[PDB]
RNA sequence: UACGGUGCUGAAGCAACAAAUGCCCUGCUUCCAGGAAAAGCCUCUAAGCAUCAGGUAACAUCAAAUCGUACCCCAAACCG
RNA sequence: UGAAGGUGUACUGUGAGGUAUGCUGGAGGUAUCAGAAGUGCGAAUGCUGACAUAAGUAACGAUAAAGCGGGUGAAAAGCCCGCUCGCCGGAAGACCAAGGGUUCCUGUCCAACGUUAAUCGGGGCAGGGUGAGUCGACCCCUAAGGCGAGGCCGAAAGGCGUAGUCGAUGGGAAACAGGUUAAUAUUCCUGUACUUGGUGUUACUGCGAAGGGGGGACGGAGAAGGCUAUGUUGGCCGGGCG
RNA sequence: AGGACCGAACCGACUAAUGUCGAAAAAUUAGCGGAUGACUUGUGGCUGGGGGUGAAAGGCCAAUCAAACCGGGAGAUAGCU
RNA sequence: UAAGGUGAUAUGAACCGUUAUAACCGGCGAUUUCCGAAUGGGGAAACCCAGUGUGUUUCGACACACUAUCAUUAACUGAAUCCAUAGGUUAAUGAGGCGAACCGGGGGAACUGAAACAUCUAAGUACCCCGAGGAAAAGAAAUCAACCGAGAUUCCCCCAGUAGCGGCGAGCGAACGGGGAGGAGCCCAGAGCCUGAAUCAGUGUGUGUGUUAGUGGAAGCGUCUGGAAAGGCGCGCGAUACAGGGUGACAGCCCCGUACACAAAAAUGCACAUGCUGUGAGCUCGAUGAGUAGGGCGGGACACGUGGUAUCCUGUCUGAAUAUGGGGGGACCAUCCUCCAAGGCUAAAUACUCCUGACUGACCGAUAGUGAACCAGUACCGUGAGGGAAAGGCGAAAAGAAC
């Protein structure tokens, strides 16, 4: 994903923080906690899509 | 007015025998938040991600057990819990 | 640089089941072949309450050393040891002595 | 520190020699006073703690050529 | 019958805690000694 | 009544007397050995500022963050 | 087709020893002649571990005291519940600070821990439990004292000390009664309050310090009055007729 | 009024017995002295080893004192066992 | 590089992947909470309290920035006072701390030995403090020799336990000369013609690299015993590979390696071309380091303890000549010889190893070897400085004993 990832627009980059923050991360660990969330996996590649558009929208 | 961060105080709702007798009978929620976390911070937070109308906000810190197995100490995170009151329109 | 894998035909060099010859399951990172219907040990299986509760012993395929097996060949009609030339742009295996690619 | 500001003439250690030479440590602190001397440069008084052989330096060569040597190290006065 | 330990946690870390160790040029030497014998507890805090 | 207690109701709910080492009293009398400090508080103006900025009331609103809170604490939990 | 090591047996040399082999052991060993040594232990009130002895002996930690019934349990003098009995009561009761730090509460488990047993536990293993505008801390201010720009002094390290800044054991704003949890409540709910700041409308209007003055702001003992907490006794109300 | 009197709290420690591998590395039991002052006590300071402090016993300075404790010189030295 | 991955105790759950945006292994970036020199102020370290500007906002508010100290350098602007300095706002740049030894300097013991003990010894040793650098320090003669001549420092072996020093006791202990390692010299206290040409100190440019990822990498079979073959037995074969390790017992040929040939997108440490902000060549004439050398007094360093004591350094009080001069040649003098102090910078041989590799032991094999083979500087002990343990091995494989 970086690849098509790197390619966008500064504003827009947020947009896609902003939705990975907002539910997802925050949706995963409070569904986690309760118990009925059976794909565990999915709070990795979160933490880590985040981490990703975190470098990527540090330019300068 | 704080955005982003305000997802990050919230980590999990609490249960228990206390956490569910103040559902009902008080109308609040018990809720594990960040370790920072003002009670500005987690009503605000609460105003927006769980969408209610909060009352206030009572906040303590739990210490964190010693736990002692096989051979070795070790003690737990001290996490903090949230006794956040709402107003008469509740929810789940 | 590994000579076996997965879907590869082995022989058994030595130990009991010496001269069968079957595919690795899966190579280990300890450096362990599992090759089927090679070292069946006869575990005691423990009947745990949660999920599913057999309770009887069974055959479990225990895991071998990778050099006590090598590739079977499928033409001379034994053991052979693996190399690694580079035909076209990749580096493929061959046997040693007919020297042929898989 | 008993040090002279002009030629640093700091003190130095030594024994203490008795008429049956028993080495008793001590000290030779230098000859040191706090001087007022008058700068013709630029019209003033300018106090420096310095030695008794230090003023004769300083009546040897100019105060201001000795200004010039303290000044030169980092010094004040 | 009164023994000499007598706690005190303001005693403890006035008298022998990180902070009054590092005032001084000796107090800095024992941390660099506890740091060069690699200890767990550098001092009590 | 799971035999733990919950739910509901609930009469009188006064007077004298005594009385502290409590409180008025950080007071009063007295004695000498003659009994911390500094802010908050109240007040007056300098340097300033004049339809300003400030005060002062009145009502409104907004807020009052963070940390400790269990339990032992003349003791089986502290020092021995 | 059984090494070293362990453990027996039979030979053998003048001795330190040596040879062969049974069992155990399950993989290393080493002729000969040379070389080098952390080269031989019974003692050192030797040093470390293990195990004896006294010995199934003393002791089981206040002479405040138990008795019986029922319950659960494999099992009950000790645990639970009940009825008696005894002990403390300016404490052996109840709240705090200091200091501990989860010892609190519930469920379960007795290997070790408990100077006995243990179903019980301050024990082990899970889960739960500490909710503050008003209590305390942090915060505004200081004493003793500490630190200390420049500074003076000191072979170096550093010592002392000024403006400052820390430092409570002291000074400075405000909440109580009732109910409630298995475990928290002057915090949760219920009632009724109070204080300090910020920011707006209105009606007035001379305000403003690193400065001045007031206050804060103070000892011992003594004595006396007025009260209150609190008690006792009536009345009153509900029950009792032994 | 009082370094007044008697006497609890509090502070002490005169006598006796118990204890002496104790319940306790200084205590218990019954008596005992002071108990508005040279009193006693909480909290925090300051004084450091030939140094402190001492109503002075060489007392006390972390169960250690006619010179603390810990590390170093250091395997001091020992005509001694 | 790659077919298997999601570190371990440590199975499981849910998932990635398999010809290439899995994992892994490197280069360069990014993030880098809080304490800690800690640096906005404080503080009982990992906590508590701030101001000025900027961008935003629905009243509540956040957000990122910046503010330590000193040291030089600059502008400021300013006392007592005329000028002024003293001071005070802001600005650049640097320093602060930590780390095993090794080095130079500032201070500096005692036990002990002398069979006691005071000079002396131990010894400028331990220790404390300051400043360093990859090394440091020393260093181009006011050196030391003997009418022969040698030509800076440093380190090794001799000279030599010699000459000396010494309560002439205990003890301490040279130089000359010689053999080696390594070699290298220059700048200032300034005036002509002529000037970028030797030189370096950067921005660099050149290959060669070396390094931090790597790739290929030879040739064995059959029987016998056994749980298992690498073992025995019998025949092969590779060897610039029989170093070593693993594998169910001892493997050249089963595997990982090994010898040998190849590798780097990127960062770097080297050795030569060489464009260069920037630096001075040949040769004239004249300079040659004053409170200094020396001296008195008191100490110290020299092997040399004031002794007949040269030499150097100095705390103290004094004081030349200054190259038709001065230092030295071990009291001193006179002749000869030799150097030229009172200012600087200089690589190599030399010392060390906290640390990173590789490799080797007539080193140890769990009471040994590090205190520590093991979650050890841990438990535990102590107010604290500080002290400080014990504890290894099932098996080839958990097939860890269903019932
Ligand atoms: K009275
Ligand atoms: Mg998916
Ligand atoms: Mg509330
Ligand atoms: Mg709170
Ligand atoms: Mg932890
Ligand atoms: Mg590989
Ligand atoms: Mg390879
Ligand atoms: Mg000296
Ligand atoms: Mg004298
Ligand atoms: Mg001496
Ligand atoms: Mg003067
Ligand atoms: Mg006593
Ligand atoms: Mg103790
Ligand atoms: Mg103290
Ligand atoms: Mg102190
Ligand atoms: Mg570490
Ligand atoms: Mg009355
Ligand atoms: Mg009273
Ligand atoms: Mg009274
Ligand atoms: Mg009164
Ligand atoms: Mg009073
Ligand atoms: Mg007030
Ligand atoms: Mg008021
Ligand atoms: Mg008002
Ligand atoms: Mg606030
Ligand atoms: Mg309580
Ligand atoms: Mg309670
Ligand atoms: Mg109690
Ligand atoms: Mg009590
Ligand atoms: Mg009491
Ligand atoms: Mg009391
Ligand atoms: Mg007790
Ligand atoms: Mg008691
Ligand atoms: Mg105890
Ligand atoms: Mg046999
Ligand atoms: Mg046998
Ligand atoms: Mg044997
Ligand atoms: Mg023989
Ligand atoms: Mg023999
Ligand atoms: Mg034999
Ligand atoms: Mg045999
Ligand atoms: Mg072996
Ligand atoms: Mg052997
Ligand atoms: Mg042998
Ligand atoms: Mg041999
Ligand atoms: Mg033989
Ligand atoms: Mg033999
Ligand atoms: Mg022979
Ligand atoms: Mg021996
Ligand atoms: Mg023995
Ligand atoms: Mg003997
Ligand atoms: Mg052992
Ligand atoms: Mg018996
Ligand atoms: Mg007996
Ligand atoms: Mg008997
Ligand atoms: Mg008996
Ligand atoms: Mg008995
Ligand atoms: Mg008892
Ligand atoms: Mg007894
Ligand atoms: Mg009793
Ligand atoms: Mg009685
Ligand atoms: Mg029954
Ligand atoms: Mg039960
Ligand atoms: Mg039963
Ligand atoms: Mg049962
Ligand atoms: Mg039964
Ligand atoms: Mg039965
Ligand atoms: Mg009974
Ligand atoms: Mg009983
Ligand atoms: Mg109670
Ligand atoms: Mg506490
Ligand atoms: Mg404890
Ligand atoms: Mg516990
Ligand atoms: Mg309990
Ligand atoms: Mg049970
Ligand atoms: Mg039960
Ligand atoms: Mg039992
Ligand atoms: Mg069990
Ligand atoms: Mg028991
Ligand atoms: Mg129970
Ligand atoms: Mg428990
Ligand atoms: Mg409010
Ligand atoms: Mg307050
Ligand atoms: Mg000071
Ligand atoms: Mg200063
Ligand atoms: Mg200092
Ligand atoms: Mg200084
Ligand atoms: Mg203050
Ligand atoms: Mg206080
Ligand atoms: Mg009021
Ligand atoms: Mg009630
Ligand atoms: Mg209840
Ligand atoms: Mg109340
Ligand atoms: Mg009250
Ligand atoms: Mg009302
Ligand atoms: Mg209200
Ligand atoms: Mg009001
Ligand atoms: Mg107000
Ligand atoms: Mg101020
Ligand atoms: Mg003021
Ligand atoms: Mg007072
Ligand atoms: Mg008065
Ligand atoms: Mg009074
Ligand atoms: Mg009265
Ligand atoms: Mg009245
Ligand atoms: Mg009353
Ligand atoms: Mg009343
Ligand atoms: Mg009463
Ligand atoms: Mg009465
Ligand atoms: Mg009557
Ligand atoms: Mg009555
Ligand atoms: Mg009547
Ligand atoms: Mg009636
Ligand atoms: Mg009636
Ligand atoms: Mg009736
Ligand atoms: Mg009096
Ligand atoms: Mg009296
Ligand atoms: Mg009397
Ligand atoms: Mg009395
Ligand atoms: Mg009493
Ligand atoms: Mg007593
Ligand atoms: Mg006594
Ligand atoms: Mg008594
Ligand atoms: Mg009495
Ligand atoms: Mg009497
Ligand atoms: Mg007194
Ligand atoms: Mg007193
Ligand atoms: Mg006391
Ligand atoms: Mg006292
Ligand atoms: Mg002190
Ligand atoms: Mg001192
Ligand atoms: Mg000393
Ligand atoms: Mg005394
Ligand atoms: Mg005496
Ligand atoms: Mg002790
Ligand atoms: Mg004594
Ligand atoms: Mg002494
Ligand atoms: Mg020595
Ligand atoms: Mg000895
Ligand atoms: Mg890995
Ligand atoms: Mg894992
Ligand atoms: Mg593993
Ligand atoms: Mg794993
Ligand atoms: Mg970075
Ligand atoms: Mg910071
Ligand atoms: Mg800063
Ligand atoms: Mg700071
Ligand atoms: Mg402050
Ligand atoms: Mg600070
Ligand atoms: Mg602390
Ligand atoms: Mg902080
Ligand atoms: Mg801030
Ligand atoms: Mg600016
Ligand atoms: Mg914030
Ligand atoms: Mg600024
Ligand atoms: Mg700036
Ligand atoms: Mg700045
Ligand atoms: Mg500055
Ligand atoms: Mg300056
Ligand atoms: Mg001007
Ligand atoms: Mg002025
Ligand atoms: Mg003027
Ligand atoms: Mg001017
Ligand atoms: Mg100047
Ligand atoms: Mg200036
Ligand atoms: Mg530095
Ligand atoms: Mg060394
Ligand atoms: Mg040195
Ligand atoms: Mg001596
Ligand atoms: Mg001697
Ligand atoms: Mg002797
Ligand atoms: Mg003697
Ligand atoms: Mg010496
Ligand atoms: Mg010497
Ligand atoms: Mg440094
Ligand atoms: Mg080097
Ligand atoms: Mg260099
Ligand atoms: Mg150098
Ligand atoms: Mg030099
Ligand atoms: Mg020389
Ligand atoms: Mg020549
Ligand atoms: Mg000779
Ligand atoms: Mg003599
Ligand atoms: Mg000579
Ligand atoms: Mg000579
Ligand atoms: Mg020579
Ligand atoms: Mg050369
Ligand atoms: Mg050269
Ligand atoms: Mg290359
Ligand atoms: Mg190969
Ligand atoms: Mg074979
Ligand atoms: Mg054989
Ligand atoms: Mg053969
Ligand atoms: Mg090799
Ligand atoms: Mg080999
Ligand atoms: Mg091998
Ligand atoms: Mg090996
Ligand atoms: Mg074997
Ligand atoms: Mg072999
Ligand atoms: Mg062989
Ligand atoms: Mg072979
Ligand atoms: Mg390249
Ligand atoms: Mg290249
Ligand atoms: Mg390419
Ligand atoms: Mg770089
Ligand atoms: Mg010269
Ligand atoms: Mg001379
Ligand atoms: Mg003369
Ligand atoms: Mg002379
Ligand atoms: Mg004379
Ligand atoms: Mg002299
Ligand atoms: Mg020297
Ligand atoms: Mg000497
Ligand atoms: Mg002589
Ligand atoms: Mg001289
Ligand atoms: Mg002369
Ligand atoms: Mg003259
Ligand atoms: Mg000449
Ligand atoms: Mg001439
Ligand atoms: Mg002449
Ligand atoms: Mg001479
Ligand atoms: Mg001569
Ligand atoms: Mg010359
Ligand atoms: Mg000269
Ligand atoms: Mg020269
Ligand atoms: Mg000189
Ligand atoms: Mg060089
Ligand atoms: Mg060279
Ligand atoms: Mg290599
Ligand atoms: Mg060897
Ligand atoms: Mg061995
Ligand atoms: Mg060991
Ligand atoms: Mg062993
Ligand atoms: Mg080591
Ligand atoms: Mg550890
Ligand atoms: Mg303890
Ligand atoms: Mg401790
Ligand atoms: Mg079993």
Same mark, same amino acid.
């Given at each position: 994903?970086?690849?098509?990832?790197?390619?966008?627009?500064?504003?827009?980059?947020?947009?896609?923080?902003?939705?990975?923050?907002?539910?997802?991360?925050?949706?995963?660990?409070?569904?986690?906690?309760?118990?009925?969330?059976?794909?565990?996996?999915?709070?990795?590649?979160?933490?880590?899509?985040?981490?990703?558009?975190?470098?990527?929208?540090?330019?300068? | 007015?704080?955005?982003?961060?305000?997802?990050?105080?919230?980590?999990?709702?609490?249960?228990?025998?206390?956490?569910?007798?103040?559902?009902?009978?008080?109308?609040?929620?018990?809720?594990?938040?960040?370790?920072?976390?003002?009670?500005?911070?987690?009503?605000?937070?609460?105003?927006?991600?769980?969408?209610?109308?909060?009352?206030?906000?009572?906040?303590?810190?739990?210490?964190?057990?010693?736990?002692?197995?096989?051979?070795?100490?070790?003690?737990?995170?001290?996490?903090?819990?949230?006794?956040?009151?709402?107003?008469?329109?509740?929810?789940? | 640089?590994?000579?076996?894998?997965?879907?590869?035909? &082995? !022989? @058994?060099?030595?130990?009991?089941?010496?001269? /069968?010859?079957? =595919?690795?399951?899966?190579? #280990?990172?300890?450096?362990? &072949? !599992? @090759?089927?219907?090679?070292?069946?040990?006869? /575990?005691?299986? =423990?009947?745990?309450?949660? #999920?599913?509760?057999?309770?009887? !012993? @069974?055959?479990?395929?225990?895991?071998?050393?990778?050099?006590?097996?090598?590739?079977?060949?499928?033409?001379?009609?034994?053991?052979?040891?693996?190399?690694?030339?580079?035909?076209?742009?990749?580096?493929?295996?061959?046997?040693?002595?007919?020297?042929?690619?898989? | 520190?008993?040090?002279?500001?002009?030629?640093?003439?700091?003190?130095?250690?030594?024994?203490?020699?008795?008429?049956?030479?028993?080495?008793?440590?001590?000290?030779?602190?230098?000859?040191?006073?706090?001087?007022?001397?008058?700068?013709?440069?630029?019209?003033?008084?300018?106090?420096?703690?310095?030695?008794?052989?230090?003023?004769?330096?300083?009546?040897?060569?100019?105060?201001?050529?000795?200004?010039?040597?303290?000044?030169?190290?980092?010094?004040?006065? | 019958?009164?023994?000499?330990?007598?706690?005190?946690?303001?005693?403890?870390?006035?008298?022998?805690?990180?902070?009054?160790?590092?005032?001084?040029?000796?107090?800095?030497?024992?941390?660099?000694?506890?740091?060069?014998?690699?200890?767990?507890?550098?001092?009590?805090?």
């Amino acid at each position: 994903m970086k690849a098509k990832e790197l390619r966008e627009k500064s504003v827009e980059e947020l947009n896609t923080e902003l939705l990975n923050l907002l539910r997802e991360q925050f949706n995963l660990r409070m569904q986690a906690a309760s118990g009925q969330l059976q794909q565990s996996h999915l709070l990795k590649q979160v933490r880590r899509d985040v981490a990703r558009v975190k470098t990527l929208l540090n330019e300068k | 007015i704080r955005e982003e961060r305000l997802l990050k105080v919230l980590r999990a709702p609490h249960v228990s025998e206390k956490a569910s007798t103040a559902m009902e009978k008080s109308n609040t929620i018990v809720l594990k938040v960040a370790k920072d976390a003002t009670k500005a911070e987690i009503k605000a937070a609460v105003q927006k991600l769980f969408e209610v109308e909060v009352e206030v906000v009572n906040t303590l810190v739990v210490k964190g057990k010693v736990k002692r197995h096989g051979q070795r100490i070790g003690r737990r995170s001290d996490w903090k819990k949230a006794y956040v009151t709402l107003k008469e329109g509740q929810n789940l | 640089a590994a000579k076996i894998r997965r879907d590869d035909e &082995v !022989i @058994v060099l030595t130990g009991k089941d010496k001269g /069968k010859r079957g =595919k690795v399951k899966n190579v #280990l990172s300890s450096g362990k &072949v !599992i @090759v089927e219907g090679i070292n069946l040990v006869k /575990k005691h299986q =423990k009947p745990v309450p949660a #999920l599913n509760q057999p309770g009887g !012993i @069974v055959e479990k395929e225990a895991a071998i050393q990778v050099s006590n097996v090598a590739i079977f060949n499928a033409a001379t009609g034994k053991a052979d040891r693996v190399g690694f030339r580079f035909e076209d742009g990749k580096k493929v295996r061959f046997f040693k002595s007919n020297s042929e690619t898989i | 520190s008993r040090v002279c500001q002009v030629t640093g003439k700091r003190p130095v250690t030594g024994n203490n020699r008795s008429h049956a030479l028993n080495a008793t440590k001590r000290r030779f602190l230098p000859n040191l006073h706090s001087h007022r001397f008058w700068v013709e440069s630029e019209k003033r008084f300018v106090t420096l703690r310095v030695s008794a052989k230090g003023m004769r330096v300083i009546d040897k060569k100019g105060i201001d050529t000795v200004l010039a040597e303290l000044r030169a190290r980092g010094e004040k006065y | 019958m009164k023994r000499t330990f007598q706690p005190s946690v303001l005693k403890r870390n006035r008298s022998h805690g990180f902070r009054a160790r590092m005032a001084t040029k000796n107090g800095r030497q024992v941390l660099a000694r506890r740091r060069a014998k690699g200890r767990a507890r550098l001092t009590v805090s």
